Amino acid sequence: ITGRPEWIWLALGAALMGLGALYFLVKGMGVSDPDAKKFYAITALVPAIAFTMYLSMLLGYGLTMVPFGGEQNPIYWARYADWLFTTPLLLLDLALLVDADQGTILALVGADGIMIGTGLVGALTKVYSYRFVWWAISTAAMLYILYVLFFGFTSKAESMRPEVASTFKVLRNVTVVLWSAYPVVWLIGSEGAGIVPLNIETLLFMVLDVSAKVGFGLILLRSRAIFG
Numbered sequence: 144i145t146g147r148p149e150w151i152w153l154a155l156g157a158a159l160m161g162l163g164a165l166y167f168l169v170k171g172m173g174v175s176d177p178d179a180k181k182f183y184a185i186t187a188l189v190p191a192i193a194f195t196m197y198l199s200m201l202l203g204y205g206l207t208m209v210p211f212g213g214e215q216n217p218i219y220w221a222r223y224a225d226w227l228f229t230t231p232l233l234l235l236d237l238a239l240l241v242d243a244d245q246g247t248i249l250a251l252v253g254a255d256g257i258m259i260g261t262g263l264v265g266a267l268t269k270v271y272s273y274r275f276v277w278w279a280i281s282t283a284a285m286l287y288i289l290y291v292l293f294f295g296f297t298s299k300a301e302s303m304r305p306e307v308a309s310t311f312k313v314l315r316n317v318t319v320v321l322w323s324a325y326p327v328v329w330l331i332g333s334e335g336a337g338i339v340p341l342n343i344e345t346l347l348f349m350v351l352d353v354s355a356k357v358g359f360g361l362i363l364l365r366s367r368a369i370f371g
């Protein structure tokens with residue numbers, strides 16, 4: 144396990160997620176506003192879940208072998224378990240910031256479930272070509288989410304106080320850039336066409352994940368917009 148080349152990036156991912164979760168909780172000790180406390184709770188829980196799943200993978204859990212394209216391919220399914228919980232919590236941060244209605248929230252959570260679930264089905268698919276049909280459906284669900292965030296949530300944010308619009312657009316921009324990278328990493332890595340080896344795929348997802356959880360969280364929790 145400790146010899147597998149990806150182990151170094153799983154270990155670092157665990158350390159950075161754990162520290163980010165602790166940082167957000169320590170920062171939240173100085174906060175009593177009820178609205179602000181909801182953002183601190185969501186935003187600390189996200190890297191705490193990722194910490195748990197990075198540690199699981201480092202310790203040899205969350206791994207399966209899938210046959211396709213000639214070979215036995217190691218697939219870390221625990222990555223998809225992390226993202227199944229953490230992606231909707233990050234969307235919930237944005238929904239709470241713009242005061243989205245319950246139906247919009249439901250719709251985003253369902254699309255996010257489609258995105259991550261069809262991702263995992265593709266990752267486990269034993270016929271090389273059908274893997275990419277699942278990837279395309281996953282990617283269309285991502286594009287739907289980003290359309291709702293970029294156009295719908297921006298319109299809602301612009302009807303609110305300027306501090307909300309200002310913070311929402313920065314987070315919106317970060318989300319579009321970072322989320323859009325994931326399907327590309329999947330295509331090039333050991334789960335897709337195998338252009339780069341698993342250790343590089345793991346490093347790329349680790350950087351995206353720390354950016355999309357700790358980076359995103361630092362932007363949100365430093366803002367005045369979270370105070371009611």
Ligand SMILES: *C/C=C(C)/C=C/C=C(C)/C=C/C1=C(C)CCCC1(C)C
Nearest residue numbers: 229262281282285322325326329355
């Ligand atoms: C904390 C981690 C975050 C923000 C992770 C985001 C993950 C995605 C946007 C993943 C999307 C994928 C596709 C659109 C297609 C292929 C499979 C996925 C799941 C990697």
Ligand SMILES: CCCCCCCC/C=C\CCCCCCCC(=O)O
Nearest residue numbers: 285286287289290291292293294319
């Ligand atoms: C600039 C980033 C936009 C990201 C969100 C959209 C993701 C892709 C999904 C569907 C394409 C939508 C086309 C919208 C055209 C622009 C319309 C406008 O600016 O008013």
Ligand SMILES: CCCCCCCCCCCCCCCCCCCC
Nearest residue numbers: 159349350351353354357358359361
């Ligand atoms: C041969 C490989 C050389 C390894 C270089 C060492 C790199 C270690 C750190 C990589 C960066 C990991 C974290 C990046 C997150 C970026 C955004 C953080 C938001 C606060």
Ligand SMILES: CCCCCC
Nearest residue numbers: 283284286287288290
């Ligand atoms: C293919 C999904 C994009 C979203 C357009 C509303």
Ligand SMILES: CCCCCC
Nearest residue numbers: 357358359361362365
């Ligand atoms: C993405 C880095 C966070 C900085 C917040 C101003």
Ligand SMILES: CCCCCC
Nearest residue numbers: 313314316317358362
């Ligand atoms: C105003 C904060 C900018 C952060 C972008 C990474």
Ligand SMILES: [Ar]
Nearest residue numbers: 150151154155
């Ligand atoms: Ar380590």
Ligand SMILES: [Ar]
Nearest residue numbers: 151152154155
């Ligand atoms: Ar490490």
Ligand SMILES: [Ar]
Nearest residue numbers: 154155156158
């Ligand atoms: Ar580490």
Ligand SMILES: [Ar]
Nearest residue numbers: 164165168169
């Ligand atoms: Ar803490």
Ligand SMILES: [Ar]
Nearest residue numbers: 168187188191
């Ligand atoms: Ar906690």
Ligand SMILES: [Ar]
Nearest residue numbers: 184185186188
């Ligand atoms: Ar929470």
Ligand SMILES: [Ar]
Nearest residue numbers: 188191192195
């Ligand atoms: Ar957790």
Ligand SMILES: [Ar]
Nearest residue numbers: 191192195196
């Ligand atoms: Ar977890």
Ligand SMILES: [Ar]
Nearest residue numbers: 195196199204
């Ligand atoms: Ar786990």
Ligand SMILES: [Ar]
Nearest residue numbers: 198199202204
């Ligand atoms: Ar575990």
